[PDB]
Amino acid sequence: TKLKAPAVLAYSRKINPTNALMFAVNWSDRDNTTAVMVGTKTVAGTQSVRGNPNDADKGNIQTVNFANLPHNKNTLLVKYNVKFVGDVFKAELGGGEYSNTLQTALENTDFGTLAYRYVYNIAAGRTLWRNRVGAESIETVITVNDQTFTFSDLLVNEFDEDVDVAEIADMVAGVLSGEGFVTLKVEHYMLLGEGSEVFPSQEFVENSKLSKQLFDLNGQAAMHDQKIGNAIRTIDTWYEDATTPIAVEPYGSVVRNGVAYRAGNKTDLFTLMDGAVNGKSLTEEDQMFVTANLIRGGVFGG
Amino acid sequence: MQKQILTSQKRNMYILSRCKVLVKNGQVCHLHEDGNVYTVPYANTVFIGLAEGTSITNEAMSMLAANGVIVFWTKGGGYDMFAADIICHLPQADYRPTKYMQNWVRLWLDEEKKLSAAKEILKMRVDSLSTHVHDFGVDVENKRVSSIVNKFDKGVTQATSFESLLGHEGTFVKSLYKEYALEYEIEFKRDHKSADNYNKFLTLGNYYAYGIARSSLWALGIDNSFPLLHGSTRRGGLVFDVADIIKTSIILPLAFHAADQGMSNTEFKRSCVAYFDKNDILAYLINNIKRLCME
Amino acid sequence: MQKQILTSQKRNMYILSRCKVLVKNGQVCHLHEDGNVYTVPYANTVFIGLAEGTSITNEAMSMLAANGVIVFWTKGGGYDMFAADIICHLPQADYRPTKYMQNWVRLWLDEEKKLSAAKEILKMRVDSLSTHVHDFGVDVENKRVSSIVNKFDKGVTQATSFESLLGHEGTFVKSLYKEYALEYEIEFKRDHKSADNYNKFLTLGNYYAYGIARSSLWALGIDNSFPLLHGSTRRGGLVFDVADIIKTSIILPLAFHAADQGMSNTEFKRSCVAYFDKNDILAYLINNIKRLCME
Amino acid sequence: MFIRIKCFSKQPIAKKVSREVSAYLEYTGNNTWEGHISGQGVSNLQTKLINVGKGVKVVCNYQDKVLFAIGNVAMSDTGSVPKYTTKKVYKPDDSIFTLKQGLVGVAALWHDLGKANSYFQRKLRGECNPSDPVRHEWVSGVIVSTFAKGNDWLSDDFIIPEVKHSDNVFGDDQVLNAVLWLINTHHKKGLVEDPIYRATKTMFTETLQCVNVNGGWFNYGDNIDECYKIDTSFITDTYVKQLNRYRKKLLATKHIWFTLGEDQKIAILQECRVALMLGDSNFSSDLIGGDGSHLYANLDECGNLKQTLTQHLLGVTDCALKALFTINHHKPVKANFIPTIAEKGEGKFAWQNGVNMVDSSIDNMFCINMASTGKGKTLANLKLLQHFGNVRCSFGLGMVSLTKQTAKQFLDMGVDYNSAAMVTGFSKSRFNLGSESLDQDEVSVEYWGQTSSLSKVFPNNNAGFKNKKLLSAPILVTTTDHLVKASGVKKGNKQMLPYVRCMHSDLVLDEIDDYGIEDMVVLARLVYLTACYGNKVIISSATITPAISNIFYEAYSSGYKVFCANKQTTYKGVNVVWWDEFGIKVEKVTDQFSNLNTRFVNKRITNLLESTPKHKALVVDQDDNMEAVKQSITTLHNAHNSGGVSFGLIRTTTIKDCVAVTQELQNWETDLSIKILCYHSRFVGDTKAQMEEYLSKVLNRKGDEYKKFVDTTTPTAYIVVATPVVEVGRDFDFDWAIIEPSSERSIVQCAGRVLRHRSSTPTTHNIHILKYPFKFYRNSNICYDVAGYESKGYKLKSKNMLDIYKKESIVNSVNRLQGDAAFYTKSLTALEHKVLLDKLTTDIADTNVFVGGWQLTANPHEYCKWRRGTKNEDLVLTDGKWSGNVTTTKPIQSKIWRKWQGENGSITVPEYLLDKTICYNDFYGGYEN
Amino acid sequence: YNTISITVVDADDVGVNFVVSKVLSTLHNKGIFNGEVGVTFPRMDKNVGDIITLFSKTGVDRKVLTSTLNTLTDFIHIGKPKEADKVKTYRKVDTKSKGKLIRRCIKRKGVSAETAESLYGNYKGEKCKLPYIVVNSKSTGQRFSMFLEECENSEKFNSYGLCIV
DNA sequence: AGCAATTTAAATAGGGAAGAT
DNA sequence: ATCTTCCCTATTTAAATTGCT
Ligand SMILES: [Mn+2]
Numbered sequence A: 001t002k003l004k005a006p007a008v009l010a011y012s013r014k015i016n017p018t019n020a021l022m023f024a025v026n027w028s029d030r031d032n033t034t035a036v037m038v039g040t041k042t043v044a045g046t047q048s049v050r051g052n053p054n055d056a057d058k059g060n061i062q063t064v065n066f067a068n069l070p071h072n073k074n075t076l077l078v079k080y081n082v083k084f085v086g087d088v089f090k091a092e093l094g095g096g097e098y099s100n101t102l103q104t105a106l107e108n109t110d111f112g113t114l115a116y117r118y119v120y121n122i123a124a125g126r127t128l129w130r131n132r133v134g135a136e137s138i139e140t141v142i143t144v145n146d147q148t149f150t151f152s153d154l155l156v157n158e159f160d161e162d163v164d165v166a167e168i169a170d171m172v173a174g175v176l177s178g179e180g181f182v183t184l185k186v187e188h189y190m191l192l193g194e195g196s197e198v199f200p201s202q203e204f205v206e207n208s209k210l211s212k213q214l215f216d217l218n219g220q221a222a223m224h225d226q227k228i229g230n231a232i233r234t235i236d237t238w239y240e241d242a243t244t245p246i247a248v249e250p251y252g253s254v255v256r257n258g259v260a261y262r263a264g265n266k267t268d269l270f271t272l273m274d275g276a277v278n279g280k281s282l283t284e285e286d287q288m289f290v291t292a293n294l295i296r297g298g299v300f301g302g
Numbered sequence B, C: 001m002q003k004q005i006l007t008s009q010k011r012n013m014y015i016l017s018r019c020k021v022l023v024k025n026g027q028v029c030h031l032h033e034d035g036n037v038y039t040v041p042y043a044n045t046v047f048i049g050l051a052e053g054t055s056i057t058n059e060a061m062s063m064l065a066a067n068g069v070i071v072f073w074t075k076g077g078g079y080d081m082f083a084a085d086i087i088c089h090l091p092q093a094d095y096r097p098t099k100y101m102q103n104w105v106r107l108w109l110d111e112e113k114k115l116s117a118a119k120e121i122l123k124m125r126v127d128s129l130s131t132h133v134h135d136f137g138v139d140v141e142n143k144r145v146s147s148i149v150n151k152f153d154k155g156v157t158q159a160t161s162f163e164s165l166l167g168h169e170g171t172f173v174k175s176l177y178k179e180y181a182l183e184y185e186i187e188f189k190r191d192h193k194s195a196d197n198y199n200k201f202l203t204l205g206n207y208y209a210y211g212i213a214r215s216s217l218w219a220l221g222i223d224n225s226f227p228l229l230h231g232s233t234r235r236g237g238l239v240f241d242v243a244d245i246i247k248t249s250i251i252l253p254l255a256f257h258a259a260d261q262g263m264s265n266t267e268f269k270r271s272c273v274a275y276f277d278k279n280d281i282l283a284y285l286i287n288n289i290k291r292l293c294m295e
Numbered sequence D: 001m002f003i004r005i006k007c008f009s010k011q012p013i014a015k016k017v018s019r020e021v022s023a024y025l026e027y028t029g030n031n032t033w034e035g036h037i038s039g040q041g042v043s044n045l046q047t048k049l050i051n052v053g054k055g056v057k058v059v060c061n062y063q064d065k066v067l068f069a070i071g072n073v074a075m076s077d078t079g080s081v082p083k084y085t086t087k088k089v090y091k092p093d094d095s096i097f098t099l100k101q102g103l104v105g106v107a108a109l110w111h112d113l114g115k116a117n118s119y120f121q122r123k124l125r126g127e128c129n130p131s132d133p134v135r136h137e138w139v140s141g142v143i144v145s146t147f148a149k150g151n152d153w154l155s156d157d158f159i160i161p162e163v164k165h166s167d168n169v170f171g172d173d174q175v176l177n178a179v180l181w182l183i184n185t186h187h188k189k190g191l192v193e194d195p196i197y198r199a200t201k202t203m204f205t206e207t208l209q210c211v212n213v214n215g216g217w218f219n220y221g222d223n224i225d226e227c228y229k230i231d232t233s234f235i236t237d238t239y240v241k242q243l244n245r246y247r248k249k250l251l252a253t254k255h256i257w258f259t260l261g262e263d264q265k266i267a268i269l270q271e272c273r274v275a276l277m278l279g280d281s282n283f284s285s286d287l288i289g290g291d292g293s294h295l296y297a298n299l300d301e302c303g304n305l306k307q308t309l310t311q312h313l314l315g316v317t318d319c320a321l322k323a324l325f326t327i328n329h330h331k332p333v334k335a336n337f338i339p340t341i342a343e344k345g346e347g348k349f350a351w352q353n354g355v356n357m358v359d360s361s362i363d364n365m366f367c368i369n370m371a372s373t374g375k376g377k378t379l380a381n382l383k384l385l386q387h388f389g390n391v392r393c394s395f396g397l398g399m400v401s402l403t404k405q406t407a408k409q410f411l412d413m414g415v416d417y418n419s420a421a422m423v424t425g426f427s428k429s430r431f432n433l434g435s436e437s438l439d440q441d442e443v444s445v446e447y448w449g450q451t452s453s454l455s456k457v458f459p460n461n462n463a464g465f466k467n468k469k470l471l472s473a474p475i476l477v478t479t480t481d482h483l484v485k486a487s488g489v490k491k492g493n494k495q496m497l498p499y500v501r502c503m504h505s506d507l508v509l510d511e512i513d514d515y516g517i518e519d520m521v522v523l524a525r526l527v528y529l530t531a532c533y534g535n536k537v538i539i540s541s542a543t544i545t546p547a548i549s550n551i552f553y554e555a556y557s558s559g560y561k562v563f564c565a566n567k568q569t570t571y572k573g574v575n576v577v578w579w580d581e582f583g584i585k586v587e588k589v590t591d592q593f594s595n596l597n598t599r600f601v602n603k604r605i606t607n608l609l610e611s612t613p614k615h616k617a618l619v620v621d622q623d624d625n626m627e628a629v630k631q632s633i634t635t636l637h638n639a640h641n642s643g644g645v646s647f648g649l650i651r652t653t654t655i656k657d658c659v660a661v662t663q664e665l666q667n668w669e670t671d672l673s674i675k676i677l678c679y680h681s682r683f684v685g686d687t688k689a690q691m692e693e694y695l696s697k698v699l700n701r702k703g704d705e706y707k708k709f710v711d712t713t714t715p716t717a718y719i720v721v722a723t724p725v726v727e728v729g730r731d732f733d734f735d736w737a738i739i740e741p742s743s744e745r746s747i748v749q750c751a752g753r754v755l756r757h758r759s760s761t762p763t764t765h766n767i768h769i770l771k772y773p774f775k776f777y778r779n780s781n782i783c784y785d786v787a788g789y790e791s792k793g794y795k796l797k798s799k800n801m802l803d804i805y806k807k808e809s810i811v812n813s814v815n816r817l818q819g820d821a822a823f824y825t826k827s828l829t830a831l832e833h834k835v836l837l838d839k840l841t842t843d844i845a846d847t848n849v850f851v852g853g854w855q856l857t858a859n860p861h862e863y864c865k866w867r868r869g870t871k872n873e874d875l876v877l878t879d880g881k882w883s884g885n886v887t888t889t890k891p892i893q894s895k896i897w898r899k900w901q902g903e904n905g906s907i908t909v910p911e912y913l914l915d916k917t918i919c920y921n922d923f924y925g926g927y928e929n
Numbered sequence E: 001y002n003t004i005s006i007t008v009v010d011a012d013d014v015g016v017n018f019v020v021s022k023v024l025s026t027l028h029n030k031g032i033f034n035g036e037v038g039v040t041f042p043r044m045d046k047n048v049g050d051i052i053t054l055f056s057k058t059g060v061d062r063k064v065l066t067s068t069l070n071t072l073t074d075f076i077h078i079g080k081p082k083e084a085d086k087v088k089t090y091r092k093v094d095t096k097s098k099g100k101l102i103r104r105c106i107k108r109k110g111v112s113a114e115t116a117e118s119l120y121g122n123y124k125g126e127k128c129k130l131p132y133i134v135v136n137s138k139s140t141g142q143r144f145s146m147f148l149e150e151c152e153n154s155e156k157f158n159s160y161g162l163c164i165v
Numbered sequence F: 001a002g003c004a005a006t007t008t009a010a011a012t013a014g015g016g017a018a019g020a021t
Numbered sequence G: 001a002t003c004t005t006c007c008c009t010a011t012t013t014a015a016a017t018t019g020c021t
């Protein structure tokens, strides 16, 4: 007993998405993909900072980025490849006095549901935060091992039953429970309207710097890989007072709301893995949450 | 005054207010002292309850319980009872537990039947939501409430353990709480210590649901010491499990409406007792435990 | 709201006769048919009883039940040999401790476990005799009483059926009742419809032990509707086992002493209070059902 | 339990209590109830009988002793229930009460004459500095002294004369000087900086003539001429007649003032000052509203002009007169007759029947309870208090947790919260986890109790929760600092509440040896003040030194002389009750206390010595104490272990010493399985509390429940390195201890932490005393001053413990009990006794214990500071983030057995160590790195 | 005047106010606010709130506006039409910053650029701290911030739900 | 039916004065 | 002085009635 957790214990990320490159298409002209360019407009304004009152007279020529659709294409296309990898129970930096006990404590994990919610967050449009808002038509095409799947009307908040997501979830759960990998090429086509302004992900700027950096690969608007990884693991409906699916965190913590849902109420990942290697009976939902964290990965040492 | 409720189907639950209950001409009668004296039918009655301003005598009590009519003491409306006997087969020539109790207790033993009946009690919470539609309340068949209902049904059906069932309980109850807060334009969280009108009206309605669930469990001879969902150390968990059938369907819209107009507690009592009388909520709980126990 | 007084240390004890029980100005009281109003200490009352010509009201019953006072009605016996039917209002609004009922159910449903509990409870009256020894009447450790309880223990040890338990029950009751009769030099036959003081003092002690037994069972949430000893003659519920654990140890020598010294019934009421209070017979019964439930 | 309650209340309140008392007892008629109830039934009846309102007149009798008495019902002195009650009972030569009335009335009509200067008027209106150059009490004293020098101050018309700046206002007239000291010290006492005056001044006026304006009143002094130009608008009807009637009262009674002794004058003027601040704060708290303008005294919360000075002086006078009347004519509310005390102690408590050898009708009692630990000392103290009748006492104990332990003992034996009041004035956040319903512990702060009649004379109806628990408690289980302020304070009215508390209540001080020397001086000052009003002092200390026991007896004897000559009774002596676990002895001692006390001490020593030796201590020869600790740990594990598992306590002196011993033992290579704990006091709220509960549950050796809190399967050395926080108030039982020597009472106390619960005698040696303290390598001149009575005035000639202690010795209380003044420079015990008689002496000095003449001054509260510590700033951990220069560090992780983490709380760092980083760590708290 | 509620729900992944602003934009672009439907917000303390409240005098039904906000249905909630005798009506307040009025001084007074800087150099630069929304304007192709504050009720409203004059 | 507010009034307690031994 | 009787003296209990739930 009293199997104390290793200080070096970490797990690798098992859902690896690429950067979500963003293109402009039409709804019936889906093959002509023109890359959405981040424009950048200059704004003239004096600097106002707390530490330098002497520098407020002149300076701060700032040039803020923006990204709209072109005025001939009404559909935004978002392309990214989500790579699910198996052996989520292998610790990369941990070892096997604790990670092997985790293997033999989370073998009864229903990966079917875990994978369903992953592919449902892929398909329903959780990966399209501010640009699925106000779109009159949502479409998702998933290409997986030469199989094409079409999704039109999936409400993203609840994980309802559709056999299309389920079909992919099968091979995704077979990867995640076993050994190997699977790759889902996900292209989202959302009809926002003619010249509607799109929403790339944001680089962190300083308190000063410029107003807003949109995410650029080679000049073209895109969204962060870790931001999509936040979308995919947004499956946590099993904490106490669970209203909406949150991103599976080791503490159940969302930064933008200023509260942590699983921290400080004995449902955090660390107490559940210590309970698993000390062998108390877990329910299915918290064990699924622990396996979702191990799929997410991260260093758990102290 | 007097009033009539039903349990199985026959009008048998009779609540007496204001009337001293005595015996005249060898028959049990009652004297609304605020008026006259009326007799009580015997063949169609088994349950008699006594509200405020009411005194029964020993000889009337003996004749009442000697003819199969069993007596309980309650708050006004007959939906919060604090004093009764235990239901047996017949109250004269035998003293054995009720079939319903025995069935319940065997259901209690098998943990698989416990899980199964837990499920059935949760299903009937959703059934109550529908059956008992409110004019002032939200529609149940709209997209958000039906999405919550099918999410709860899919969660209960696919559940294999009790902890997942209680997690689904928490998310269903909050979801209905946040949706009724959504339509009433408030930011409501369920706290029993909270001093606003919505929470304390919900707490009072929960107490009246506990009382009517206690009457429904007592009416079939089943003690409230056998919780389906709640833990084995929770005192009176079965009365909480029975009251959860009507708590999210009847107590919640009545309490939110009565906090919306913001009137006092006595006509909130009157609204709750009137809603229990008109749609026979105690009868539906009786038939609920009927279809729970016999299978 | 504080600890609300635990039931085993409740001390007051009454059976009210020819008085309407009411509430004046805060307290529960009883008003006889001459204008006399005597207050009932409801916070320390274990049980009240209601004889012929008694009539309790609603809020009086509520103040007894919410405080936790079990209330019965003495009349109802209509057979020739049996104390037939006593009607008893349980305070179920206080939600009870649960796992003691679960333990009682797990011993009740298993037939060999009920027989095992039947065994230990039959020798519980034997050890009751040994512990609760009066200063008057017989001495427990004489040759005749020890010989009959030794034959009783030898026969109940080799017993295998509940009808054998009923037969040995009958020989035990005949043996004790007649030995007490011999000591007090009277001829004794137990008839509940007799004018002899050894008999109606025994029926008064039957009512007293009934009230003590429902307060002991309700203090642990145990219903009367689970009789671990049953039969054609023995059909009263669990009260006719936890009530006559303490006949031949407490009540029957006290009833014979009260019928030998021969003042009124009130000295017998007060003597039952004194012996149930000094030796803590209620807490003794509760602790015995405690060591029954977890074994 | 059979009780009987009788009620003699009037009005409809009589009927409202009848509902509750008829809810719990049967009605026997004629407003008398009688019946059987339980222990907690009596409590629920108390709680809902007192809370029902004011005017409840209830007497309860359990068998024939009175259980409780609600209100000031006279009830029973001999018989119970009177009949023709009426007034004019005794009407004596009260004399000293008329003296206190005259002094308080004359001073209270003159206490605020000095607010009439123009500076105080513009201070209240707010166009100058709110701090006066000279305080208004001194200006009023200048007014009264100038009026006395000019006209005859006792029988003349008043008229305020032209006053100037006077450095001193104290003359020779003893009564005038009393009035002047009451006027000047109605806010704060004068402070004398002068060393010759502090050296020599003893008498009443002869010390009071040294109280000048420079002792706090003369703040800055640039507007003195405006501070002494005064208007005379007080000459009205009711003020002049009140001044005349009180001055003539004083005139008629001052003939008994010269027949008083010094001790009387000091105590009477202390009572007068306490009543004067009571009346002044009572009238300053409430808002009277009406005013006659042109002159003002106080300000409201809005700063508006209120309480004009004529009616302010009149209100302070009547409130102080009423304060005096209720504090001098109070039959105070006492505790319940606890029925679980009065029966006989069985087995190891069988000595508690020594109360059946004490007289139950003695007006005074000085208990010296020399019983050893584990015998139930506090229960015996409650038994001794209840032997004289109903209990009214203040259990003043060191530490919060020891008050919690005595409260839990009082709760589970027989005492409810209607009689007990646990007071810890810090609101600590140490909560009980695991199960709130299944706790049956954690004594809390509610006090249903009974509000005393003294709350109406305090400011704004006493206070909220805390002062109601202070004043109105029958039994006040409190930390001691809520009682030592009775002897007096620097600034404010914080003296009055413990003063009026200790006036009508007994004082029970347990383990007074753990306090400091100045702490013990002010505790014996409190003992003297408690004995000044006839209350009984119970001292409960096993390791008492004759010096301490003597000076506490002399303080009680001076107090009982005050009380005897105050009621005009001839002083027969003090009923001294020597007590231990082997016997009791009650003697009427007016003189020769020393021979009787030493004879009882020798009898207790002979009753301790024929018992088996439980603590055999060997002083090690190894010079270096690091490897001495190593070798002693190895030896006492190889000798003293329970099947391979042994518990060791390394008692060291200070915190960096503790972390040095810990960091050496963690890096110490050995075949022994050392498991190290740090147990000093510098720890965060969470971490510290966690250590406490764990240690209390693993070192409990009365049963084998600890086998499940540690790994006793594997042979392991469970070592706890601790500072003197282990030797005070800890119910710990170690297999053996290694002690760094600081004082001999530390040796006796850490012997009391070894085999505290067991009775098995050691074979070879269970204590290994180190050769030197670790301060020898840092300061060879003085090394025992930290946590010891060595100092700069008392230096050991040698620091070797072979020279200053026995090499093999059975350590018990005998060396501390005996008392030796000779050879104090080369033995630790005689060094200890020397200091104890040279600081707690029978003199008045200035920081001494018989203090007379200086009680009038602020000197015993400035130069004798209770809990005199270092500056002490508090670095606070807020949610894992430290406040100041802390820098969390990482411990050695070699042998730590248990380490609890902390996130909140605070650490107490001395200002000396604030310069550098305290470097807080999870294992060991504060150090120098 | 009878009124209807549009409460933004489940907008945590996206700010609540972005959904509120998109609700305003979709209510603008598909008609709704012709001249008589107005908006109000029950929870302006420092944020604009999460409830849009439409108090049209003729009466707003659920069906027309739920067909209008078909794009926001994933995170919207619509209450049944209730009544209110008094609604707390807000209006539009706009900000000007330097060059704005400079171009006005180009086109109204006809003065040169340097003297237009000269008359406005030490002036202007007001800073509105009122609660606001962020609006896509479609006729003028740039996105801006619109400030709302409490004013007396007006009979006529704009195409956005705010008071006129 | 219990209670509460609130009146109404009968009675209980006490203090002062005066008359006895 | 002590004690009793009687007159204030008003303070102190018990009943009575009656909306209110
Ligand atoms: Mn002052």
Ligand SMILES: [Mn+2]
Pocket (backbone or CB within 6 Å): D111, D112, D280, D284, D312, D316
């Ligand atoms: Mn003042």
